[PDB]
Design a protein around this ligand. Sequence first.
Ligand SMILES: [Zn+2]
Ligand SMILES: [Zn+2]
Ligand SMILES: [Zn+2]
Ligand SMILES: [Zn+2]
Lengths: 180, 178, 180, 178
Amino acid sequence: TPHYLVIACSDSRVSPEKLTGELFVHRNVANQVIHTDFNCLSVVQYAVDVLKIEHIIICGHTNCGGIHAAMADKDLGLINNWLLHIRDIWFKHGHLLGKLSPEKRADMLTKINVAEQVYNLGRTSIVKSAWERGQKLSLHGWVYDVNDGFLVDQGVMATSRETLEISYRNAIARLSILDE
Amino acid sequence: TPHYLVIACSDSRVSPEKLPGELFVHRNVANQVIHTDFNCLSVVQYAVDVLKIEHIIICGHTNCGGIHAAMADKDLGLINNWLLHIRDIWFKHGHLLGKLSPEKRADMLTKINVAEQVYNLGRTSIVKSAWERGQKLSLHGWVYGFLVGVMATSRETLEISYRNAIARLSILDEENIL
Amino acid sequence: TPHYLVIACSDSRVSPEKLTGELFVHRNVANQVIHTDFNCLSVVQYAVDVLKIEHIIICGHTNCGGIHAAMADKDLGLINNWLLHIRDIWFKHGHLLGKLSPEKRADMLTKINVAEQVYNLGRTSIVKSAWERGQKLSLHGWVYDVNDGFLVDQGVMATSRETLEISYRNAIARLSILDE
Amino acid sequence: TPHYLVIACSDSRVSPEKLPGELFVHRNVANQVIHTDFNCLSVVQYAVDVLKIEHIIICGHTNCGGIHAAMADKDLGLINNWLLHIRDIWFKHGHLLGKLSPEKRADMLTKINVAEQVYNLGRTSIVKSAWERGQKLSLHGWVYGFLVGVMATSRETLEISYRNAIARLSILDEENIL
Ligand SMILES: [Zn+2]
Ligand SMILES: [Zn+2]
Ligand SMILES: [Zn+2]
Ligand SMILES: [Zn+2]
């Protein structure tokens, strides 16, 4: 029975099964781990403390309607509140996203979003505690592209608090090198 | 582009994409719609108000870990709180479920659970408002090699269809009685 | 420093300080402990596991706008979702509430609501665990009346899972005896 | 009947009712407005849309346990997750805070925190919509024997007032620098 928790986007048309009964699956809009979302956290706590799942994959995707909607900033109603976390992420990386041509930002934000969600998952009390008590647990952030059908392990792979901080830092720095 | 929102369980072996790009998908433990879950409510509000999705399917499944875990009631930690809503639904139907033999109880609760979550979904401000302003929106509760319920198209048919599912489930087959 | 967590209503005009720096305070609409509300649960977990607060009081009040709004069933918007938990409580006790004259139901629902929130608090993983590991912890449900300025310890006092189940049962049964 | 919503901290010694039946009150740990907290959002939506409350006050306080706990970063369990939003705000202002001496850092974060939570409140769909439809609504961020900030009346003045509070807080008194 299952060995991977995958956290993926609700509007991704590639299923996690296809892009990988190994799988325990959470999906939400823009593949978020929000610090205080009982729904995702519950899932994570069950996967780690009960099922002893040893890999968590957060998978984003290009051409993601949740990302595009966080960026366009329309009055969508309740979902805007959900998407504000992604807006906080755009402004965390505002200088970086402003250098790019505007048809290119969404795909940058999509990758940055994945790194930030991994960083959040790694910071939950649940994952911190598992790493502190010796439990073998790895986090991964991937981004999938259906323009291709293909994948990028998005620079973020973490196996301890140490490797989370480092791999988070370097993913962002690797994303800050710009294709002319 | 998407025409269906599927709310399904995180431990389900099968992709909701059994049954491609017509699906918008939310997965959580025991396929719940909790009145006040920002995560599931956000998905529903976006599907309905923004994407104009005209069908919401809550799809449960038999041999559900989350259902079993809610009944075993061990100290699992945080997930126990999430599963408390499942234990409320168990006690709402305690006389019913006690009339089954032990080994049949899980699969009944799985079925009851779907009906209850459809009732919740239909009582959201999101869905009630969409029906009140004439939007076409149908809700479905299914249980997943076949798909074995509840079907709503308005607040009156939600009430009808929920009460019928429960009465229908209250009628016990000999092979299930204790 | 503090020895009581009080959970009270956001629209109550009597403050918990007055009706009791002893106090750590949570307030929300209709003084709820909802199973999966990270906000209240957080508070409870901190009070019990960190501050080692030994008493939790849930205090309701008569003439409570949250209760009245759950009962009238207007399209209020987002808050209706919050108040649905209270609607589930009305229907848990529908036969009992139908016997009463309609000008009397709200005050009955207010008291029943308090018993149900205590029962929920007692069922959290946090409180179950504290009782299981020997920690001294008492729960109380009170209802305050500003028609009077006065109090009723609403039949629900709990110090273990055992006393929670019992005291919950008897509170409801005591509330089911009707004043002709 | 009520004219003020007060969002204050659960560990505050003083009743928000220092400063009677004019107050509708929400209390949580470190007086947060988290974008997706159903509890606080519900209160705000009811105050604004239903009770027609024209003022929202986020009132923080010095010597705040929740702020201290977020900075100490011990393994407290569930509450750590709630306090993570506070640590995000710390790191958003990491260069600022690192320029203070250690024993002054808490009280700066308390002040920053209020400003950040007012910014959150002003960016809610609830508040943005109320401003967009012309409703009179002002937001305030205060820190509590005196009341030592941010004041918003529209989305443009929210932006102005938030940026000014942060720049104003960035100007360091000699007695606070390290
Ligand atoms: Zn997406
Ligand atoms: Zn399942
Ligand atoms: Zn009240
Ligand atoms: Zn405080």
